[PDB]
From a paper:
Noroviruses are highly contagious, infecting both humans and animals. The human norovirus capsid protruding (P) domain binds histo-blood group antigen (HBGA) co-factors for infection, and a recently discovered bat norovirus (GX) was also found to interact with HBGAs. The principal structural difference was a variable length P2 subdomain loop (Loop A), which was located near the HBGA pocket.
These two equivalent residues were lacking in the GVIII and GX P domains; however, an aspartic acid (D367) was located nearby in the GX P domain. The cross-reactivity of the P domains was determined using direct ELISA with a broad-spectrum human norovirus Nanobody (Fc-NB26) that binds to a highly conserved region on the P domain. The GVIII P domain also had many Fc-NB26-binding residues, while most Fc-NB26-binding residues were absent in GX. Subsequently, the bat norovirus could be considered antigenically distinct from human GII noroviruses.
Author numbering:
A (entry chain A), B (entry chain B): 226 to 522
Write the structure that this text describes.
C-alpha cells in the first residue's frame, strides 16, 4: 500500500515516550547532545527499535514477580516482559519493553497483584533503576503485601526530575557507565547539517521543580504514527518521506519536513528554538533522497 | 476505502475505558442490565459518542483552574475541556471528554501546574464526583499549592472500588440522583436476543479489594479500533460487519461475530460466561444485515 500518515492533528495524538497528549511541536537547534531515545522508535516499514512497545499501552507499564515478602517498605521484583515471559538480561536488552529511557532521581509508581493487600504506591530510586540486571528494588512501598512469588503489574506515574535536560540522557540501565553490551537504538542525528530534529513534546508530572518548573519530554514519532506503521505494509521507496504540515482549517501550509526512513522528522532553517502550531496535520508528498534540501521554515 | 480492522492481536491493543493493555476477552450472558458506557463509543463511520475523547491519551486526564488557594488538603478546580476551552456546565454534558464513566468510592489522581509546589496527589470522593457541575473538589491533596487562579493538569490513576459491578453503573455526574437532564450515549444492547456483548477487558489498579481481589473493566471497542475509524473514511454498507476471530499463527478460526454499525461486537450461542484467547486477530469478512444469525461460538 502507498505510504501515508494518519489524518490526525498533532494535538489529537499522543507521546510515544510518556503516556500523555502531545502539547508542543518544536525544533531546538541548540541542544547539547543528540538524543538516543529507546522508546518511540520505529522505522517506516514497521520495525520497532529499542524498547519501544508494540502495544501502545505498555509504555511506562511493568510486570514481575516478588522475590521476597515486603519488609521495611521494600518490594523487589524479578522483571517479566509484557507478554508475561521472564525478562532475560542475557538478551542484550536494556530493560523490558516500555520501561523509561531517561535519567531521573526517582520513578514514582503504583502497582497491584491479583490478591488482596497488594495495591500500593512506591518508587524506584535512580541508584535502583538498573532493569538490565533483571529486577528492580521498589522502595517507599506502602502496601503490606505481596508475599514472595506473587505476580505484580504496575505503572510509572511521575518522576523526580530536577533537570529537564536529563530527559535526553539515557539511564545507567545496567548500573554502570558502560553500555557496550546493550543493544541500543542509535542516536538520532539529522543527515544534512542545517537540519534540526522536529520534537513532539508532552508534559509529564514531576517533582523537584524548585530550580525551574517547566518539564517537557520529547519523542521522535507520535504513538499513533508508530501504530500506523505496524498496521500497514509500507515499503520505504526512498531515504525519506517528504511531508507537508498543513493547518487544515485555515489552509495555510506551515512548513515541509523530512521523515527519514529510520523514524524521525527534521525541518530546515531553524537557528533558534522554534515552536509550531499544534492544529496542523502532516501529509505525505513523495519520497526523496537523504540530501534533498528542504525549504526553510 | 473498503472496510477493515487493524491487524493487531487483542493483547496488542488497549482499553478505551481505562488506559491499560487489554488482558481478557469474554462474553457474559448473565449481566442483568445493559451497559451505558460513555467512553469507548464510536460508530464505524468514525463519529464519537458520549464523552469519548478524540485523542486517545486524554482518557482519564483532566485540566482546569484552581478556584481558591489550597487549604486543609482541599483543591477545587473549575474544569476545562481537553482543548483548554472552558467546560460549560449548563450545556448538558455529563463531564469533560475522557472523564471516568462509572461509579467508585474514590478516584485517585496526580496533578501539577506550571509553577513549583503544585505537584501533588489527591482523590475525588464519590460524593464529590460531580463534574457535570463544572468543577471537582479534590481532597487529600498533598501539595502546598497552587494558589487561586492557577491552571492545573492531571491524571486519574486508580480507584477505590468495592464492587466490580460498579464499572457498569454510571456515576451521578450532576449530584442530582440521576435526574435525566444529561446528554448520555444510549445503552449497548445486541439487536438479536440470542446474542451476547463481546467485552474487551483490562485490569485497573484499585483499592478496596480485600474481599474480592479481581477487578476487570470492559469496553466495546479497543482504542486502536476507534482511532482506525477516525482515520479512515468508511461507509457501512450493512447493518453490521461480519468478523472472524482467528489465531494467525496456528490458523485456527475461533469464532465469528458481528460488529454493529453503532460500535460494539456480539457473539451468538453463549450460555455461560466464556473467555477467549487473546492472541487472535479480528478480520473483516463481509457486511451483513441485523437479522443475520452467527454460528454459535
Amino acid at each position: 500500500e502507498p505510504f501515508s500518515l494518519p489524518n490526525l492533528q498533532t494535538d489529537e495524538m499522543s507521546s510515544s515516550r510518556w503516556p500523555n497528549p502531545l502539547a508542543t511541536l518544536f525544533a531546538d537547534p541548540n541542544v547539547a547532545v543528540a538524543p538516543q531515545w529507546q522508546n518511540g522508535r520505529c522505522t517506516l516499514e514497521g520495525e520497532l527499535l529499542g524498547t519501544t512497545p508494540r502495544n501502545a499501552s505498555w509504555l511506562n507499564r511493568f510486570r514481575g514477580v516478588s522475590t521476597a515478602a515486603v519488609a521495611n517498605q521494600v518490594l523487589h521484583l524479578t522483571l517479566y516482559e509484557p507478554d508475561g515471559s521472564v525478562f532475560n538480561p542475557l538478551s542484550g536488552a536494556p530493560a523490558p519493553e516500555g520501561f523509561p529511557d531517561f535519567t531521573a532521581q526517582e520513578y514514582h509508581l503504583r502497582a497491584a497483584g491479583k490478591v488482596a493487600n497488594t495495591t500500593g504506591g512506591g518508587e524506584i530510586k535512580s541508584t535502583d533503576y538498573t532493569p538490565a540486571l533483571g529486577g528492580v528494588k521498589i522502595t517507599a512501598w506502602d502496601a503490606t503485601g505481596p508475599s514472595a512469588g506473587v505476580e505484580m503489574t504496575g505503572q510509572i506515574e511521575s518522576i523526580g526530575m530536577e533537570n529537564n535536560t536529563d530527559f535526553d540522557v539515557l539511564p545507567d540501565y545496567n548500573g554502570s557507565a558502560f553500555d557496550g553490551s546493550l543493544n541500543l537504538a542509535p542516536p538520532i542525528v539529522p543527515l544534512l547539517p542545517g537540519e534540526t530534529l522536529l520534537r513532539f513534546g508532552t508534559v509529564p508530572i514531576t517533582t523537584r521543580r524548585q530550580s525551574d518548573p517547566i518539564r517537557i519530554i520529547s519523542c521522535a514519532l507520535p504513538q499513533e504514527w508508530i501504530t500506523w506503521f505496524l498496521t500497514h505494509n509500507f515499503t520505504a521507496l526512498g531515504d525519506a518521506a517528504l511531508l507537508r504540515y498543513r493547518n487544515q482549517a485555515t489552509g495555510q501550509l506551515l512548513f515541509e519536513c523530512k521523515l527519514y526512513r529510520s523514524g524521525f522528522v527534521v525541518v530546515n532553517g531553524v537557528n533558534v528554538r522554534t515552536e509550531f502550531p499544534m492544529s496542523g496535520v502532516f501529509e505525505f508528498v513523495s519520497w526523496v533522497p537523504n540530501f534533498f534540501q528542504l525549504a526553510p521554515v
